[PDB]
Amino acid sequence: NLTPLFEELLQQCPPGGQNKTAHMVSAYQLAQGNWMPTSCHVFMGTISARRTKTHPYEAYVKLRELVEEHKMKTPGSSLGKHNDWIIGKIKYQGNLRTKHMLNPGKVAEQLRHNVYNKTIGSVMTATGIRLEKLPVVRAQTDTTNFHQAIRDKIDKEENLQTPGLHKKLMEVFNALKRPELESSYDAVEWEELERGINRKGAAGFFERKNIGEILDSEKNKVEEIIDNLKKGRNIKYYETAIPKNEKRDVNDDWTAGDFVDEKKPRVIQYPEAKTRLAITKVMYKWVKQKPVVIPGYEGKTPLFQIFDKVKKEWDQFQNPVAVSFDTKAWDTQVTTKDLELIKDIQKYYFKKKWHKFIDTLTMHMTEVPVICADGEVYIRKGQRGSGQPDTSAGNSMLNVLTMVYAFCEATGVPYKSFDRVAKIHVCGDDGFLITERALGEKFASKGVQILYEAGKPQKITEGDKMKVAYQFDDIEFCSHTPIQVRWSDNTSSYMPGRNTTTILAKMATRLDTIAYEKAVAFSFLLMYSWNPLIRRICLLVLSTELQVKPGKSTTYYYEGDPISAYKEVIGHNLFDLKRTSFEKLAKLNLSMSVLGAWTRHTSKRLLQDCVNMGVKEGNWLVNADRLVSSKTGNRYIPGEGHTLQG
């Protein structure tokens, strides 16, 4: 009966190793009684117990007392010599009130709003969409809640992990390495680096120049950093902490969608622009995954392609299920040992001449001086800073290894046989695996405890089970879920679905012109053309002032005709989309009704606005909508057009 109470307590036990010298009993065996726990060090959900005529609740109280004794003993740490320089910049005593990491004081101070996209937002208002009923997106936070987020999320000790965990994770890696690439990676030239780089990439706290200014004028400074690291010499490594959606919350690289910003931690932590340049120039091939050596890495997969790709795997199983990865605050769960495992993997692929570079950078990353925007300093123990160049590749590989390990240990499948029974997909900490139902359910019921012991605790859920999808379109990935559409050529495919309320909110607002808005409308049309409401808002916006070209600040833009650009990447004309999955559409429209963001008139008013425009003489983008054209009697004839990134 008390099995759920024990299962909960086992998730508070310190991870331990296998104990052959004693009896290792589970939460079920404990709940049976006649089992006296001798220590709280948990291994695969089991602890050492003595056989001694014990009542179940007695065993529970002994285990709990053991956990509290252990917790009431697990200490301040010496600062590394290579971090001493930051103490020299301290001017005032600190007020972060951190409990588990040093707050040595505050350095001297150094020298964004959510506004409507007026055209997009007024098209919505014109149809009776109630903007003020849409959820809040891109919220900022004040200094007081920012420091609280630091105390809540970052101010912690490193996770304890199963003794010998990283040896096993390296064994998993050896089952998926690419030996033809061993010791082959070298730095890239400035020209290749500058091709894929956001020149607006943010300056660190002590920095004035952004990525582009440094590239134009201080390459020697970057090269000095590279040289120091290459020879194993310390650099003045630090990260700057800002609240999400602050002005310096800028992505160095192109992103596949706004989901990347949305999954960011509340606390953005990033190295200096000069230092990100130094890291990226040398480690380019790893941090950019050129080539892709992380199995299932979808970081480069456009969101309008991902679910068609995944459905082909799904169709190959007899009774497939998908098990979601749902780690709590992943970046705060990355340990020093985790980082050293990734370093060893990077040294596998890089030429030996960069091994000291990788050693020294990783050392700097194990104990990081972080300077808040307001000047407060904390010394972070391990973890991931979300603005590190290695965030996507390092987290993705760490996630793949940890999940393969956890799946194999839950199911009995050997590491080298994972690829025979399951397919994995990751984007940083986000992801899932597809496997046959029996294995998936085994993994979902045992994985919670195993993943906790591996230092990647899962979000707390019902009966401590990982989320299982029993039908393809219940998969969740990159904040989206598959939705099927029917094309006029008697085929079906999948698009990235998401709640209509959320899509509207993201489309309607930005953080601090029509050229930008038209790029947004095109970007959203590539993703959400399955959604008749989004589709028609997009077509109206794209109908605005045909003479102004789309801006290039967002995920995608079009050269020439946006309707032809759509066809180029989607594979059909917009006009050939004849049906969207009825059941899934209703699911993703529910919150429009719950929140009152629309009324019984909204869809017809938007249709009628499109028809009014499309019946008029001329070549109107709105007639690319199959139903609109059916009511207007006119079609859109596309010119030439191409989809571009950036």
Residue numbers in the entry: 13 to 86, 89 to 125, 131 to 531, 538 to 671
Lines from the paper:
Compared to the RdRPs of other Flaviviridae representatives such as the NS5 of the Japanese encephalitis virus (JEV) and dengue virus (DENV) in the Flavivirus genus and the NS5B of the hepatitis C virus (HCV) of the Hepacivirus genus, the pestivirus NS5B contains a unique ∼90-residue N-terminal domain (NTD) that does not have notable sequence homology to any other viral or host proteins. The global conformation of our CSFV NS5B structures is consistent with the recently reported CSFV structure with an RMSD value of 0.9 Å (95% coverage) between the reported structure and our representative C-682 structure. These structures together reveal that the NTD adopts a globular α/β fold with an α-β-α-β-β-α pattern. The NTD interacts with the palm of the RdRP core intra-molecularly with a mixture of hydrophobic and hydrogen bonding interactions.
We hereinafter choose the highest-resolution C-682 structure as the primary structure for illustration with difference between structures discussed where necessary. In the structures of the WT and C-682, residues beyond 672 are disordered. The results indicated that residues 681–694 are not essential, as residue removal in this region did not apparently affect product level (compare lanes 7–9 to lane 6). The RdRP core of CSFV NS5B is structurally consistent with the BVDV structures, with an RMSD value of 1.5 Å (92% coverage) between the BVDV NS5B N438 duplication mutant structure and the CSFV C-682 structure. Different from the observations in the WT BVDV, full-length JEV, HCV and the recently reported CSFV RdRP structures that have a canonical fold optimal for NTP entry and binding, the CSFV NS5B ring finger bent toward the pinky finger, partially occupying the template RNA binding channel. Although this conformation is likely not compatible with de novo initiation, normal activity of the WT and C-682 observed in the polymerase assays suggests that the canonical conformation also exist in solution and may be in equilibrium with the observed bent conformation observed in the crystal structures. The aromatic ring of Y471 side chain is wrapped around by NTD resides 23–27 through hydrophobic interactions and its phenyl hydroxyl group forms a hydrogen bond with the carbonyl oxygen of C25 backbone, while the carboxyl group of the E472 side chain forms two hydrogen bonds with backbone amide nitrogen atoms of residues M56 and G57 and its two-carbon aliphatic side chain region interacts with P27 and V57 through hydrophobic interactions.
